[PDB]
Every structure is written in structure tokens, then in C-alpha cells.
């Protein structure tokens, strides 16, 4: 996360920290006790489910947050229509199961996030939040030890397709979001994480961090998987 602020898991209780056996891989979001949703490009190079570890209720990258839960990946579902270069259908599902053979157990540091209703997204200009352990600066080598979050505004497909933006690289299955001053944004390491918006009432997983040209660059918004356009897929796989 470029700019923004530090936070603890209490402020984004559905955030899942995904690692590979051990280094960090990507963020994710708990949509149900047994299911975490993320981005396929995060695991494409290592599709083997047994190579991953998922944590819930974790606020620190390399330290065990008090109250956290650790899970193995019982099923790593990548999207069969995924394609790259811009990422298409960048969505993935991880069915979690602890060594005790149980799914997530809700708590003050672990809760689920509601999915959007079919094709129901906030109006462009709406402020939403993004969370992750990604770089705080494009030139950084290290990722922050403390979870971060920030606010970005939804950009219409109209605007995002403009010349100076992404033109045709962005599709209707993607959502663009950025800061009006381009001073804050998601970055390397934030992929798979949540783009949460208050949809007239409740916090809703409107998007999943997917891709972007650089980070916090003028006319280069963050691009997110448009969750409200993947409900059939999520439904059929859960």
C-alpha cells in the first residue's frame, strides 16, 4: 500500500494473509468460514495446494498476531479462464482447513465479508478501502511488517479506458480505483487483497486487487477484479 495508514486486523477482520512454504504471497478475503477468495495470478506459478499456508486474524507479516488462526489449503481453485497480459479473470478460491480439521472460527479478529449482489457496484467516485502487506514505495525491496490500508475512489470504465489511462487493457469485468491526487494506491504484494465498499448499508467485497501500471502513478489507476461479475463462478465452486 502506497501512502495510507497502518492498521491491525481488527479493522479488516476478513483479511487473509497467504504464504508459501516460508514467504508471503498475497492477500485474500474470508467470504465464508471455509472459504477465502483471492487472485489466481498469485498462485499460477505454484498451483500445488499443499505449498500454502493461510492465516486469519494476523496483523504482522513475520510475527504471530495474538489470536490468529493457521490453515492448510484443502482446495486451491484457480479460474480456468485466467489469462495474462493486465490479468483476466484474476480470481481464486482457497478452501481452508486447520490441522484439527476445522474451518475459520469467527472472533473479534476474524469475520467474513459480504459479497456484492449480481452486477451491483457503487457509483463511480465512491470511496472504498484496500488492505494489504504490499510495498509502501515502488522502489522498496521489503514489504511492511505491519498491515496497511488506504482509501481510493472508484473510476468509471469510461474514464479508465481513456487514452492516457489503460485504454483497451481494462474490461467490464475489471474495476479501476485511484486517488484523485494519485498519492495512495495498492502495489506489489497487495494482489489478492480486498477492495471494500459500503454498498448503501454494508461493507461489501466489491473488488480484489489485481494489477496496475506501476503504483500511485498519474493516470494509472489500480485495477481490481469486479466481484459482482463473478458470482456464478463463486457459487458453482463453493
UniProtKB/TrEMBL annotation:
Instruction: Give the EC number.
Output: 3.4.21.73
The record describes the protein's role as:
Specifically cleaves the zymogen plasminogen to form the active enzyme plasmin.
Q: Which organism is it from?
A: Homo sapiens
Asked if the keyword Repeat belongs to this entry, the reply reads no
As one GO molecular function, the record gives:
kinase activity
Listed A to Z, the keywords are: Disulfide bond, EGF-like domain, Hydrolase, Kinase, Kringle, Plasminogen activation, Protease, Secreted, Serine protease, Signal, Transferase, Zymogen
Predominant cellular place of this UniProt entry's protein: secreted
**Per its record, how is this protein called by name?**
Urokinase-type plasminogen activator
Q: Specify the Peptidase S1 domain's residue ranges.
A: 1-238
Listed GO biological process terms? proteolysis; regulation of wound healing
**Domain of life of the organism encoding this protein:** Eukaryota
Tell me if Cell membrane is a UniProt keyword of this record: no
- Places the protein is found: Secreted
Placed within the complete protein, the shown segment runs 159 to 403 of 411
Assembly, in brief, is:
Found in high and low molecular mass forms. Each consists of two chains, A and B. The high molecular mass form contains a long chain A which is cleaved to yield a short chain A. Forms heterodimer with SERPINA5. Binds LRP1B; binding is followed by internalization and degradation. Interacts with MRC2. Interacts with PLAUR. In complex with SERPINE1, interacts with PLAUR/uPAR. Interacts with SORL1 and LRP1, either alone or in complex with SERPINE1; these interactions are abolished in the presence of LRPAP1/RAP. The ternary complex composed of PLAUR-PLAU-PAI1 also interacts with SORLA.
User: What cellular component terms from Gene Ontology apply here?
Assistant: extracellular region; serine-type endopeptidase complex
**Catalytic reactions on record:** Specific cleavage of Arg-|-Val bond in plasminogen to form plasmin
Q: Identify the enzyme class.
A: hydrolase
Amino acid at each position: 500500500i502506497i501512502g495510507g495508514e497502518f492498521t491491525t486486523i481488527e479493522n479488516q477482520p476478513w483479511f487473509a494473509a497467504i504464504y508459501r512454504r516460508v514467504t508471503y504471497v498475497c492477500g485474500g478475503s474470508l467470504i465464508s468460514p471455509c472459504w477465502v477468495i483471492s487472485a489466481t495470478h498469485c498462485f499460477i506459478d505454484y498451483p500445488k495446494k499443499e505449498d500454502y499456508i493461510v492465516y486469519l486474524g494476523r496483523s504482522r507479516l513475520n510475527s504471530n498476531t495474538q489470536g490468529e488462526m493457521k490453515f492448510e489449503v484443502e482446495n486451491l481453485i484457480l479460474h480456468k479462464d485466467y489469462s495474462a497480459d493486465a490479468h483476466h479473470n484474476d480470481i481464486a478460491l482457497l478452501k481452508i482447513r486447520s490441522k484439527e480439521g476445522r474451518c475459520a472460527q469467527p472472533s473479534r479478529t476474524i469475520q467474513t465479508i459480504a459479497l456484492p449482489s449480481m452486477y451491483n457496484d457503487p457509483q463511480f467516485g465512491t470511496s472504498c478501502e484496500i488492505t494489504g502487506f504490499g510495498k509502501e514505495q515502488s522502489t522498496d525491496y521489503l514489504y511492511p511488517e505491519q498491515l496497511k490500508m488506504t482509501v481510493v475512489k472508484l473510476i468509471s470504465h469510461r474514464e479508465c479506458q481513456q487514452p492516457h489511462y489503460y485504454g483497451s487493457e481494462v474490461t467490464t469485468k475489471m474495476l479501476c480505483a485511484a486517488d484523485p491526487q494519485w498519492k495512495t494506491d495498492s502495489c506489489q504484494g497487495d494482489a489478492g487483497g480486498p477492495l471494500v465498499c459500503s454498498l448503501q448499508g454494508r461493507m461489501t467485497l466489491t473488488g480484489i486487487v489485481s494489477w496496475g501500471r506501476g503504483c500511485a502513478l498519474k493516470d494509472k489507476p489500480g485495477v481490481y477484479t469486479r466481484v459482482s461479475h463473478f458470482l456464478p463462478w463463486i457459487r458453482s465452486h463453493t
